[PDB]
Symmetry: D2
Subunit: 400 residues, 4 copies
């Protein structure tokens, strides 16, 4: 192993479904943070960029045929730069970062961009080919979210629980009450409201231009509900019926966004005049039962911390993706961290900010690093649950 | 050094479009080699498997939402095993192996499976959402091959040349005659027919069970062993009578899957594995989309500069045969004879077909197979990528 | 042949594409005039209704599988009442009336409803089946307007000219200027604006209930009563600057339904109906598809030859205004002045819109309405048809004596 | 009401779903009987044809935008000849004949062609527009058979029972046993088998030629019959709607492709054009019933026609009762007072053997009733059929002496 440094990092705002980014093609959306990294670091010879690594969970729409390569071409990067796209659903953007990290760490590259994109607004319909002449069985399925082309052997053995059903399964199996879930969701809105007002998100964001009438600029996260009250949350009806616990209020949404980071060896930092902001420590993955996918981060974090020989206490910032309050609380309880820890999602998370699957994992690493710089903390841990039962964890350390 | 070894490696047969594997869902197809590797190596505690890495170029069909994880669950691997899917179009399967290699090389994992899948038979149609109430503008597009949801900025700047058009561009720009392309295609069919008859492909292949009573698919379906130079010389070019690329000097559209075991020294010792090769390294390069077939040249050169090796250092070169034109253009730029017996000794994709995600993994698997049969040392696997890339991966047989 | 009477007649307002009626399923929309006739004539034993005949040009969407029978059931008519749907594209609604007329005229039934419906807003996409395992050639086609599933034998022999191109072919071959087309369009907008202001259309219309709180849709959405000659003269032609057909001298894409009661002398007496007109007859004709707009000329001639009437025996002529070019070319062939006050006296489809299946029912309904207002005797309704047809239907107001 | 004659009449063979006619566009298929009427009757000035009327149940596919006019143009008929398409689902082709009849009977025209077409093989999929930006609710529906774009009000008030369910409802409410349904099915296959061997269908049929790189196929024979059907093979089939029900694939018609067309003429037109008058049309009547028991539709349609003509059912030498399902065939015969096994009912078999291309079937019933009257020397024929969403239609004819 040699050392690997995260240098510059930017993200787009995150839009609501059908919202402020809904007119931006996924490939063009993935380009925006790449173009911004080129314009923010003008001292770099971009023909020395070894690879662009992007996470993308869909890849059926405008993000088809390796959107990493589509996006780097659209962003103005030299045609000599290769690109590759990663799919670990919800954790694709974190996976891109770990994958760029491992490539640099064993000496195969010097300089890379890793991040992620999802346009859930523009997710297309898919239709299976007829497998016989004049086939009457064709159907179209929405790829915004959820299962399509269901394998009967998968449904039989593992189920096809929608994500909110998995979050109810976690609330049942780990005993996470409606009240604790709603209190977690309120803290995410409150912390994100304070961060919004302080300009913490504006420090992360690069704006998107919508060419419409006249050009407009998207600059603000659209998903947050900073006026949320505990009383409003307690009135919401659960997604899966009156005795369940998961609601639209204690869960993230469907969203659009992109993010990208520079990773570099020590030599690349010195050749290209980069600011090394953090060292990557490592990434680990784990499988769990698909029906309780939200608990994924517990064995992923434990595999990483065992190999790094570190306790959860060694971390000043923990970014635990808030796909659902039920699974966030259950992961914190298993790992021995207080429900309301100020070290965990200190500026709020996905319940406030939304969850464009491919982008989210890149956002978590980006914002952990950002919060370490503001707080003068040392170690950061980013972790998230993954559809069909996985977790992923990635640790960093601020450069002193 | 911190060595990474390729152990067991297997592949399905390769099916024609609408052919012998066309009834097998992409996810079930991917699961076939994973289940074969489990059954062939029962001394392994499979709960110690760190990751499944699969290449897949499409991911809109039965391969959606991370086919690596779908396939490992369908194959019977424990749910504790994570999976991730890579997309570098044509080279996805080679990228999977290189990615597993890097994860083990830097100490993050011990034991991985890497491979690839493509069901081009069962690739779906895609339809964009309406952006307006009562939208009249919707259309469906085929994802079997080629461009869909064309970005007009991509089309203006780099073009949207179909793969056979790029191959014609390489023929013109690198002066590769029709006659040279057709002779290359004939050698592929002849080398392939010999290897078939010798039972070489059968040693790589694990059979696919098709449920009707039940049948077994065991034989590669794409090869045309009775091909003649006169039969190739008579075909009309895809892009008109001036041009050189035909259906005969080109790969087709195909279905298949492959998977390899990769392991640290420690994992080999712990799980009683047979190490067969050491992975030396992988490199990628970009080129102009319009001549994507030349991608292997700067990828090979990047890898060989880092390893400190000349192209003559390799006993086997597996160069994907997407198009005879780009195969020859690459061989001539690299200083290797058109007809070299070191290059694709048992034939390539013109004969065997090209299920995108699978091909990269097949090239590594079969390079290692050929090294064992010949007593050679170093193998080089390389291939072009749609939208202008190349990938190269080098291996070395163990002593 | 016995006499056949038109009794009560009603229509929905006509909506724009994606406008005021765009949320109403085609079948529900067809039910609205049927239900209005039942509630307006509560005297009648509706179990004696012999048939519902509706026109509909599309029948792929919510109007699939015989919208006449769907609509009569949704309207609350007894399940004992049968229904049949007619498709002569643009003239389907007129054909429904003429078909009811003929059934009653040769004694096969006593009492019918005839009308038409179109929801061009909600027209679906269609997709051919794959003719081979793993077929790669599938596509989807919009059914809102225009050609789909094109037969190469039809394209080669007759062409697949879009409707506005056929209107440009009629303007070229019959020499109809841009300026005469624009002046014909202006007259339709002015005439319809006077008719709107007087409450003439409100008398035709029954409201559509939109479920949200519920709203009512009560007035035509398509008219542009502030239209000026200057504003029409500025519009760019559909098929390029050397052509004449525009958005302003042509009808639109529209939603609407209409229905009329038809009865024998015996049904009028038995059910206590008010007879308002007798049907004199219907005739159809084919022309070249490329000049479909001239269809009404041989249709009107064939009808008037059999009825032994000249064109000036008609107090009202409702000529569908699909395009000003073909309206003018038709009036000039029949010897009727471009600006006649007998022709479309309350304006036409350039103002009101053209929901294909409904328009033909609307023309007969509004011809009869105009006869009652003016004290006129005979009306003629005639319209052009896609792929080269014309249809013409003549009525005579029932006159009292002493 | 003056007299109206049926003159020449022809049909394609009936193909199976995805079978012998499956490569023929619906509009080209409809053109084949029209082209054959022209070639068989060169004594006609075809510029005097007043109208082509075709039945068609679907009209979403290659049959879109008035297939009557598309087909007469493809058939080579002059562009001066108008056409109109009727939709009464299963009865559309009978409706076309009645409609041509009524136009001639009240003096509005002299010479017409009437018939029907269905290509159930090539029926397309239909997809509703999204009613909102980025709508997630779109779906496609097969239009081969069955409900699409279901109205929740129709489902709540009347149901959306598929056709076989309606036939099970008729078997339950009218007490029609599985045994009687299978014996009815067997008689249809045996009668169609004898008619086939006798060349009876060959006299009705004009061939379709299909081209391609494997050469020409001449399609000449009905493909749906299973003349080797046995009672024990019928009795082994599993019912469509579960073990308690009676309707099977063996005691029901299928999904099929075909076209048919008939010449109708006034006395004067018969004279002027050198036509052979074969039958007088007596009349047509329609009736509604509950959609859930649509198979009983022919009972009130027949009773209404026979009341107005002042005829008893026994005045007919031939009854062509469409065999959509044996259950409704038998229920209708028992209501009209005609024996289950009558030799006057479907003497040459019916839709259980021959198939049911919706728009075409009603035209075939009238065509083949007239044919059987000519072979037998019978005087009066009755054609009747049930209709999806609860109708019947009945049409009566009289052989010219």
């Amino acid at each position: 192993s040699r050392e690997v440094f995260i240098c510059d990092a930017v993200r787009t705002p995150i839009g609501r479904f059908g919202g402020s980014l809904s007119a931006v093609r996924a490939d063009d959306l993935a380009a925006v943070p790449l173009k911004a990294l080129v314009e923010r670091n003008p001292g770099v010879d971009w023909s020395a960029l070894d690879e662009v690594f992007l996470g993308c969970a869909n890849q059926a729409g405008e993000d088809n045929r390796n959107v990493a390569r589509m996006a780097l071409l659209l962003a103005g990067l030299p045609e000599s730069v290769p690109g590759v796209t990663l799919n670990r659903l919800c954790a694709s953007g974190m996976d891109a970062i770990g994958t760029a990290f491992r490539a640099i760490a064993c000496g195969e590259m010097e300089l890379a961009i890793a991040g992620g994109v999802e346009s859930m607004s523009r997710a297309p319909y898919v239709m299976g080919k007829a497998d016989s002449a004049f086939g009457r069985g064709q159907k179209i399925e929405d790829t915004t979210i959820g299962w399509r082309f269901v394998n009967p052997l998968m449904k039989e053995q593992y189920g096809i629980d929608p994500m909110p059903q998995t979050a109810d399964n976690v609330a049942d199996d780990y005993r996470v009450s409606r009240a604790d879930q709603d209190a977690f969701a309120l803290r995410s809105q409150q912390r994100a409201g304070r961060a919004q007002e302080a300009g913490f998100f504006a420090e992360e964001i690069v704006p998107v231009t919508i060419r419409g009438k006249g050009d407009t600029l998207v600059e603000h996260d659209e998903h947050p509900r900073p006026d949320t009250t505990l009383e409003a949350l307690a009135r919401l009806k659960p997604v899966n019926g009156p005795e369940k616990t998961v609601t639209a209020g204690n869960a993230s949404g469907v969203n659009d966004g992109a993010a990208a980071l520079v990773l570099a060896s020590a030599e690349a930092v010195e050749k290209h005049g980069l600011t090394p902001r953090a060292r990557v420590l490592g990434m680990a993955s784990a499988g769990v039962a698909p029906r309780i996918m939200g608990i994924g981060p517990v064995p992923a974090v434990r595999k990483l911390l065992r190999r790094l020989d570190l306790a959860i206490d060694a971390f000043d910032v923990i970014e635990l993706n808030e796909a659902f309050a039920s699974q966030g609380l259950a992961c914190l309880r298993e790992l021995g961290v207080a429900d309301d820890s100020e070290k965990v999602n200190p500026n709020g998370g996905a319940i406030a900010l939304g969850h464009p699957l491919g982008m989210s994992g890149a956002r978590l690493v980006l914002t952990a690093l950002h919060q370490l710089e503001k707080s003068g903390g040392r170690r950061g841990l980013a972790t998230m649950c993954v559809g069909v039962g996985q977790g992923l964890a990635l640790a960093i350390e601020r450069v002193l």
